[PDB]
Design an enzyme around this catalytic site. Sequence first.
Site, PDB file in Angstrom:
ATOM      1  N   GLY A 162      26.529-123.468 -83.039  1.00  0.00           N
ATOM      2  CA  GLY A 162      26.158-122.349 -82.107  1.00  0.00           C
ATOM      3  C   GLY A 162      25.107-121.458 -82.757  1.00  0.00           C
ATOM      4  N   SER A 163      24.286-120.816 -81.936  1.00  0.00           N
ATOM      5  CA  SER A 163      23.271-119.893 -82.440  1.00  0.00           C
ATOM      6  C   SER A 163      22.996-118.765 -81.424  1.00  0.00           C
ATOM      7  CB  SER A 163      21.965-120.664 -82.631  1.00  0.00           C
ATOM      8  OG  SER A 163      20.987-119.809 -83.149  1.00  0.00           O
TER       9      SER A 163
ATOM     10  N   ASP B  96      36.397-113.726 -81.040  1.00  0.00           N
ATOM     11  CA  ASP B  96      35.256-113.381 -80.240  1.00  0.00           C
ATOM     12  C   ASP B  96      34.086-114.277 -80.735  1.00  0.00           C
ATOM     13  OD1 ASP B  96      33.032-112.422 -78.972  1.00  0.00           O
ATOM     14  OD2 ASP B  96      33.975-110.461 -78.711  1.00  0.00           O
TER      15      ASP B  96
ATOM     16  N   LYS C 221      29.703-118.545 -90.280  1.00  0.00           N
ATOM     17  CA  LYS C 221      28.762-117.784 -89.495  1.00  0.00           C
ATOM     18  C   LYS C 221      27.777-117.066 -90.403  1.00  0.00           C
ATOM     19  CE  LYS C 221      29.987-114.818 -86.136  1.00  0.00           C
ATOM     20  NZ  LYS C 221      30.286-113.619 -85.275  1.00  0.00           N
TER      21      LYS C 221
ATOM     22  N   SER D 112      24.370-117.449 -86.406  1.00  0.00           N
ATOM     23  CA  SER D 112      24.575-118.837 -86.026  1.00  0.00           C
ATOM     24  C   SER D 112      25.706-119.434 -86.855  1.00  0.00           C
ATOM     25  CB  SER D 112      23.287-119.615 -86.170  1.00  0.00           C
ATOM     26  OG  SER D 112      22.916-119.661 -87.500  1.00  0.00           O
TER      27      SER D 112
ATOM     28  N   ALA E 155      21.020-114.365 -81.294  1.00  0.00           N
ATOM     29  CA  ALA E 155      20.306-113.310 -82.035  1.00  0.00           C
ATOM     30  C   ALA E 155      21.124-112.597 -83.121  1.00  0.00           C
ATOM     31  CB  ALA E 155      19.725-112.224 -81.038  1.00  0.00           C
ATOM     32  N   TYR E 156      22.466-112.587 -82.997  1.00  0.00           N
ATOM     33  CA  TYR E 156      23.320-111.900 -83.996  1.00  0.00           C
ATOM     34  C   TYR E 156      23.720-112.846 -85.169  1.00  0.00           C
ATOM     35  CZ  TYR E 156      27.472-109.427 -86.027  1.00  0.00           C
ATOM     36  OH  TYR E 156      28.403-108.895 -86.909  1.00  0.00           O
TER      37      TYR E 156
HETATM   38  C1  LIG Z   1      32.995-118.139 -88.380  1.00  0.00           C
HETATM   39  C2  LIG Z   1      33.363-116.914 -87.567  1.00  0.00           C
HETATM   40  C3  LIG Z   1      32.990-115.625 -88.068  1.00  0.00           C
HETATM   41  C4  LIG Z   1      33.346-114.446 -87.329  1.00  0.00           C
HETATM   42  C5  LIG Z   1      33.984-114.590 -86.067  1.00  0.00           C
HETATM   43  N1  LIG Z   1      34.291-113.395 -85.355  1.00  0.00           N
HETATM   44  C6  LIG Z   1      35.244-113.207 -84.455  1.00  0.00           C
HETATM   45  O1  LIG Z   1      35.963-114.118 -84.000  1.00  0.00           O
HETATM   46  C7  LIG Z   1      35.459-111.774 -83.970  1.00  0.00           C
HETATM   47  C8  LIG Z   1      34.404-110.801 -83.969  1.00  0.00           C
HETATM   48  C9  LIG Z   1      34.689-109.517 -83.474  1.00  0.00           C
HETATM   49  N2  LIG Z   1      35.962-109.265 -83.071  1.00  0.00           N
HETATM   50  C10 LIG Z   1      36.975-110.160 -83.114  1.00  0.00           C
HETATM   51  N3  LIG Z   1      38.245-109.754 -82.664  1.00  0.00           N
HETATM   52  C11 LIG Z   1      38.249-108.607 -81.760  1.00  0.00           C
HETATM   53  C12 LIG Z   1      39.686-108.060 -81.560  1.00  0.00           C
HETATM   54  O2  LIG Z   1      40.567-109.145 -81.171  1.00  0.00           O
HETATM   55  C13 LIG Z   1      40.555-110.210 -82.141  1.00  0.00           C
HETATM   56  C14 LIG Z   1      39.160-110.842 -82.271  1.00  0.00           C
HETATM   57  C15 LIG Z   1      36.752-111.500 -83.543  1.00  0.00           C
HETATM   58  C16 LIG Z   1      34.324-115.860 -85.552  1.00  0.00           C
HETATM   59  C17 LIG Z   1      33.997-117.038 -86.296  1.00  0.00           C
HETATM   60  N4  LIG Z   1      34.348-118.315 -85.845  1.00  0.00           N
HETATM   61  C18 LIG Z   1      33.520-118.878 -84.950  1.00  0.00           C
HETATM   62  O3  LIG Z   1      32.581-118.280 -84.454  1.00  0.00           O
HETATM   63  C19 LIG Z   1      33.800-120.273 -84.502  1.00  0.00           C
HETATM   64  C20 LIG Z   1      32.774-120.973 -83.864  1.00  0.00           C
HETATM   65  C21 LIG Z   1      33.028-122.305 -83.444  1.00  0.00           C
HETATM   66  C22 LIG Z   1      34.287-122.840 -83.700  1.00  0.00           C
HETATM   67  N5  LIG Z   1      34.615-124.135 -83.331  1.00  0.00           N
HETATM   68  C23 LIG Z   1      33.614-124.988 -82.660  1.00  0.00           C
HETATM   69  C24 LIG Z   1      34.062-125.500 -81.270  1.00  0.00           C
HETATM   70  C25 LIG Z   1      34.252-124.536 -80.103  1.00  0.00           C
HETATM   71  C26 LIG Z   1      35.360-123.491 -80.378  1.00  0.00           C
HETATM   72  C27 LIG Z   1      36.078-123.220 -79.046  1.00  0.00           C
HETATM   73  C28 LIG Z   1      35.463-124.224 -78.058  1.00  0.00           C
HETATM   74  N6  LIG Z   1      34.765-125.246 -78.884  1.00  0.00           N
HETATM   75  C29 LIG Z   1      33.791-126.103 -78.132  1.00  0.00           C
HETATM   76  N7  LIG Z   1      35.236-122.108 -84.381  1.00  0.00           N
HETATM   77  C30 LIG Z   1      35.030-120.822 -84.807  1.00  0.00           C
END
Ligand SMILES: Cc1ccc(NC(=O)c2ccnc(N3CCOCC3)c2)cc1NC(=O)c1ccc(NCC[C@@H]2CCCN2C)nc1
Length: 348
Positions: free
Chosen positions: A27-28, A164, A49, A33, A30-31
């Site tokens: 995923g990618s 999120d 990330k 990837s 502006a904030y």
């Molecule tokens: C690495 C990472 C770094 C930071 C974050 N941030 C958050 O989740 C986040 C940011 C701000 N607030 C958050 N809170 C707000 C209060 O309630 C709880 C969550 C949560 C999340 C991730 N994780 C991911 O972005 C991510 C991306 C893809 C993935 N799997 C790939 C496949 C996708 C996932 C679901 C559907 N699939 C096709 N797993 C984790």
Amino acid sequence: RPTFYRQELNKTIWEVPERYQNLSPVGSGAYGSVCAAFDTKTGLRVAVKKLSRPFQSIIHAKRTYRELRLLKHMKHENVIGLLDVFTPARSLEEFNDVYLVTHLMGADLNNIVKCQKLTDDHVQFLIYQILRGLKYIHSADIIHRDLKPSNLAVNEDCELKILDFGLARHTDDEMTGYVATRWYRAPEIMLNWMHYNQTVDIWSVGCIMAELLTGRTLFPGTDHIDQLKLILRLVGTPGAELLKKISSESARNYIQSLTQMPKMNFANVFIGANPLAVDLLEKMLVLDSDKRITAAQALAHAYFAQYHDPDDEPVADPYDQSFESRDLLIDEWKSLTYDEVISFVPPP
Ligand SMILES: Cc1ccc(NC(=O)c2ccnc(N3CCOCC3)c2)cc1NC(=O)c1ccc(NCC[C@@H]2CCCN2C)nc1
């Protein structure tokens, strides 16, 4: 200090500790990837990330600090936590990039609802877990505000975490038209009626729970106004008490122009559903947010009898978010973020 290696992935150089192998873009925006990877130290499939130019402006630097603070604090089975945070910088002077690591999620709840047989039992378990996670985050006065099926990840055992995934900038264009980014939003957030509270997220839970029961979006509006009409059709137009709480006078004045409508019968909208699910939905989807059931009260509702255990629904440690009102310069947000990166201790 670990050893770091470099590699280009689509548009930028990723520089990460050796423990992290087989990075592959997922995923990618502006904030930031995200790449999927294998963490050889823990045996976990992880998401990494890399924030995009996290200190480019005061807004970006504060958002970087905020997300790092939030993830460092959240330690609950139904909420995403932080496995690692790193930077290749060896000092504050050279600090410019921040990488956050979490478990790699699989399916989200759209992937579940779009194509499975959801029994009432599945619905109780999935909603139970969202409410369990929300009791926890709300106990810390952390409000999600963008709860929707794409932000809920669900494993083959139907275990769920709240996250999120958003990688973009927050924006007007984003909530415009026939879009899932608005369908789950509480109407007071959608139309900026007032200072909103943590039960904005309970409204979203009502919308998600309806959709797992029927397989259809509850309020698939074609724009903000169309969506408001779908909402008022179901829950009825606001009465005098709620009207007063609408601090926006133009907004208050707009709702008064609408023909009054009574709250509908939910058993005739949710045909065939468990009467206790219908009861719970009536308590979640209340227009006046002062009157909505809270996550803690919902976990005690009979719908969840098979799952509820008041000794295994924890609250969070106190979470200091006084920084939200702190007036700081970019380099001060950057130094606070640096200290949080270097003080991180990994989970057991
Ligand atoms: C690495 C990472 C770094 C930071 C974050 N941030 C958050 O989740 C986040 C940011 C701000 N607030 C958050 N809170 C707000 C209060 O309630 C709880 C969550 C949560 C999340 C991730 N994780 C991911 O972005 C991510 C991306 C893809 C993935 N799997 C790939 C496949 C996708 C996932 C679901 C559907 N699939 C096709 N797993 C984790």
